[PDB]
Subunit: 330 residues, 2 copies
């Protein structure tokens, strides 16, 4: 079953143009200087002006298509893989297709949703489509605007969140190219759903029904209980991931590329690995929801100089709760 | 690439227990007797009491698991494929996993979202996972509560919508079994997104932002423009679908099994095919959003007596706008 031929052919990014410095936030909202860097690990972030999520997605997608040596007309499947929805109907796939100028193309455009780990799951879905020869040139887009959710009365909130979009074009490798997935795994522990959820925004507590409370549109987070899920299940997760590629270990991999919604995952990794092994984006882009992991993948290649033939590890924990991991040769 | 080995191993359904007769709706809201049957093609529907979407999904999933000769512990991937979300975070996959008693199982639980054609796209995704030997026993759940959206001032609304859940367990076929997919196709025309959309409910018109209007939480439908997309692109869609299986035609298929959000698709089909060829569920279950097509698949097998070795056609048009079609041997 592994290794699976798989090429990340192109990568793209769009971020809002205006830098919001943590120093300016601290000055404006009476926080101690350096508070965001110490507490959040965040020095800057970007917030949209008038952009829509589909707009940012399309901008990133166009870059990734250029990067792959392709034209937009060459893409034969679009997968939206964001952490949050632009609107209720339709899903983000058709919306980004339209924004790209491909609205009359017929190219199938769909959404894969695993909350903030959507991008990962989309890669995995795309890998199987590619190897089954169903589609040849797949665009995966992750675009999120969190700045909409900002609450300027809560520092743990308004200093944490940022906006970004990142995209990938994935294909089969050309003859002689070593690009592949060595291991991939997803596990879900839905008993943890309650420890990171937003109970509003759907049928369960529809505004026009009888199950609404004032707190419906906020993140309900139980940090201690989330870590307990980690304590109990992460060791066996990692064991089973690396068992898929018994001849490849973490020492054979140049970069660890994590979903990074807070500094904690990075701190954990920094105690374990040399700093040059860890791909960091939260420092300049903050928590950008579903765009986090693909932003880090973009960073690994376009700043970190990840070379074809070198190996990486995608890793993350997300609401669900789910755990993902993938070991790949770029 | 085709035919693809593929077995619909088990099917399940849950519908609310209480029948809401069109005759009683007409009596209560001063509509002419027979209006719902004539205008909507709907004689009854089911509306939830206190059920959650995850609850209904789990009930259907359990039936499908029993139907496949399996235990819940045997399922190795869960795909939620509903037309609408239960809540904002997490997605419906972890929620149905939890409801099923599998919250500590680790079984990956994700969502595929193509609006009301989610079930179709999930089948297609599952087919590739199965044939790549990634997973063996995949549960696909489509559960929607629309009765939450009912507006008892608009007859075209409150007489149209119903609640339902349906599920499938899909596997590879056993030796000697002919179960397969002969053809599968998805096309999307995102220029039609505006002709069937709900612009609220996400980042674009977040309640706490500056782009809200009073009509944000309603379906914006342009029926004439939607049909035009059909006129222009459906003939080539059908041509390309059936070209995938040049030796199999519609005469070789026992049932047409459509996504049926209104009577129009059924009327179109009824002018073309004998009535016994068409699988109807809207008459008793109304427009049940993403559950429509899998409800019809359940009906084909569990009422229509679709036999192993006989062939069917899944078909639908959905918000996006997207078109789907699949020709399969059961």
């Amino acid at each position: 079953v592994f290794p699976l031929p798989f090429k990340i052919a192109g990568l793209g990014r769009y971020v809002p143009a205006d830098v919001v410095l943590s120093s300016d936030l601290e000055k404006k909202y009476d926080l101690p200087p350096g508070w965001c860097v110490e507490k959040q690990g965040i020095r800057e972030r970007r917030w949209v002006k008038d952009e829509t999520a589909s707009f940012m997605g399309a901008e990133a997608a166009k870059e990734a298509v250029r990067d792959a040596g392709l034209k937009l007309e060459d893409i034969d499947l679009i997968i939206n893989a964001s952490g949050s929805p632009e609107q209720a109907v339709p899903d983000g796939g058709p919306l980004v297709q339209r924004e790209l100028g491909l609205g009359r193309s017929g190219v199938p455009s769909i959404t894969v949703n695993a909350s903030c780990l959507s991008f990962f799951v989309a890669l995995d879905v795309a890998a199987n489509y590619l190897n089954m020869r169903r589609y040849k040139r797949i665009l995966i887009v992750s675009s999120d605007i969190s700045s909409v959710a900002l609450d300027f009365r809560k520092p743990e909130n308004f200093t944490l969140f940022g906006d970004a979009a990142a995209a990938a074009v994935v294909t089969l490798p050309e003859p002689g190219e070593k690009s592949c997935i060595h291991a991939s795994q997803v596990r879900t522990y839905g008993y943890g759903a309650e420890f990171s959820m937003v109970p509003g925004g759907g049928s369960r507590r529809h505004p026009n029904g009888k199950n609404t409370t004032p707190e419906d549109n906020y993140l309900h987070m139980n940090g201690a209980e989330l870590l307990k899920i980690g304590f109990e299940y992460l060791p066996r997760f990692n064991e089973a991931l690396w068992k898929q590629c018994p001849d490849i270990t973490i020492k054979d991999c140049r970069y660890v590329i994590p979903h990074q919604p807070s500094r904690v995952v990075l701190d954990y990794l920094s105690l374990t690995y040399p700093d040059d092994k860890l791909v960091r984006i939260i420092d300049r882009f903050a928590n950008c929801i579903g765009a986090s992991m693909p932003m880090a993948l973009y960073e690994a290649v376009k700043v970190g100089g990840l070379r074809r033939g070198e190996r990486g590890v995608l890793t993350g924990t997300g609401s669900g709760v789910s755990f993902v991991g993938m070991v790949f040769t770029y």
